[PDB]
Amino acid sequence: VLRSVNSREPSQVIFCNRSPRVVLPVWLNFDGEPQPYPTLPPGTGRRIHSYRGHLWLFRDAGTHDGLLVNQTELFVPSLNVDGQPIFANITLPVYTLKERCLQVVRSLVKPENYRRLDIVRSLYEDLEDHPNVQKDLERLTQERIA
Amino acid sequence: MDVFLMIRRHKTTIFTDAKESSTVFELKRIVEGILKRPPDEQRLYKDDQLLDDGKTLGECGFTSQTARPQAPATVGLAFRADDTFEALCIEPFSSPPELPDVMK
Amino acid sequence: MMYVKLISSDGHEFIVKREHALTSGTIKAMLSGPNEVNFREIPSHVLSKVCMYFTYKVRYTNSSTEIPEFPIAPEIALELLMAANFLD
Ligand SMILES: Cc1ncsc1-c1ccc(CNC(=O)[C@H]2C[C@@H](O)CN(c3ccccn3)C2=O)cc1
Ligand SMILES: [Cl-]
């Protein structure tokens, strides 16, 4: 269900990284599969060539943590009005304290040593469930239908 | 613009927000509504310097850069006990344990 | 507005806005039945960071502005994870 539409209508977009993370732009092709694009260092902007109806999502380039674009999960370029590009403001979401804690413990402990931490069993499973573009797309297609 | 603070005295901490243009006196009115002590029985500090009631919080050094929601600035508090003010005493928080072997 | 007191295991009292403390579902339940909540396993170096998270969450949720990172020092990360899991 979630895929770019092959409109062939050009649309200029500014990918503006308003986050402290290195951003990985991800384009969902016409079969719904994610393709990685060049990364954006924190606080940088790039004027890029895209098309109307094309579906984009943005992640942390090192850990694949989910990021927002114009306060939502997916970005679709629209027609350029008055010779102006469309801004795609990539920002950090307000993560839950538990998710932010999992992000920091994952950045310090190797996955083979998660089981060595003196924590409850459910927290080992939470640490192992790393951010995954494939999983979040399934969750988004299910909520798009419903 | 808003400034986010921790008003600290002995073993009590108030997490509150205020405008950068608001005064030290207006911050004492906030403390009055929580700890039930009037502004004349209060002294607010930054590190060790006593703050004058008529200055703005920005004029004291509490700005969007030093007083953030996720990193609030500390404002020391000392109450008046029978016509004399107690010495400013802020008990520090507990020390974290040694960093685990797998995290090192 | 309304305030609540959250006491750490080492005796520190944290006075926070009731709306902010209601970020945690566990705290909401503790205030619904059996304005003070005592945490016998959360120390002050963890509970002070939990209170900083509540104001961070209330300030930046639904805001259309640049969101800063919520910082966590490596020394407190594991205990803060345990507290966040209990508090939801
Ligand atoms: C500098 C930079 N930094 C981060 S990302 C980036 C960037 C670089 C170059 C382009 C140029 N456009 C494309 O490569 C895509 C855009 C897509 O919307 C459609 N598409 C594509 C291709 C093959 C079949 C069908 N469509 C394309 O040509 C974009 C971003
Ligand atoms: Cl560019």
Numbering used by the authors:
A (entry chain A): 62 to 207
B (entry chain C): 1 to 104
C (entry chain B): 16 to 49, 58 to 111
Give sentences copied directly from the paper behind this entry.
The Von Hippel-Lindau (VHL) E3 ligase is a component of the CUL2-RBX1-ElongingB-ElonginC-VHL cullin-RING ubiquitin ligase complex, and its natural substrates are hypoxia-inducible factor (HIF) proteins hydroxylated at a conserved proline amino acid by prolyl-hydroxylase domain proteins. It is one of the commonly used E3 ligases for proteolysis targeting chimeras (PROTACs), a recent drug modality which holds promise for future therapeutic strategies. PROTACs are bi-functional in nature, linking a moiety that is specific for a target protein with a moiety that is E3 ligase-specific. Currently, the chemical diversity of known VHL-small molecules is limited.
Based on these encouraging results, the diastereomeric mixture of 1 was co-crystallized in complex with VCB. A crystal structure of the compound bound to VHL was obtained at a resolution of 1.98 Å. The well-resolved electron density allowed the identification of the eutomer. The hydroxy-piperidinone motif of 1 occupies the hydroxyproline recognition site of VHL, forming conserved hydrogen bonds to Ser111 and His115. While the RHS motif is conserved compared to reference molecule 1, ring expansion and amide inversion leads to an altered exit vector towards the LHS. Further optimization of 1 to engage in pi-pi interactions with Trp88 and Phe91 from a pyridine substituent can be envisioned. Interestingly, the eutomer observed in the co-crystal structures exhibits the (R,R) configuration, not matching the stereochemistry of the original player-designed compound with the (R,S) configuration, but does maintain the key pharmacophores. The co-crystal structure in complex with the E3 ligase reveals that the observed binding mode matches the player’s original idea. The identified hydroxy-piperidinone core as a bio-isosteric replacement for the classical hydroxyproline motif provides an interesting starting point for further structural extension. 1 was submitted to protein-observed NMR experiments: Protein labeled selectively, with 13C-methyl groups in the residues Ile, Val, Leu, and Met, was used to obtain a KD = 182 ± 76 µM by fitting the dose-dependent shifts.
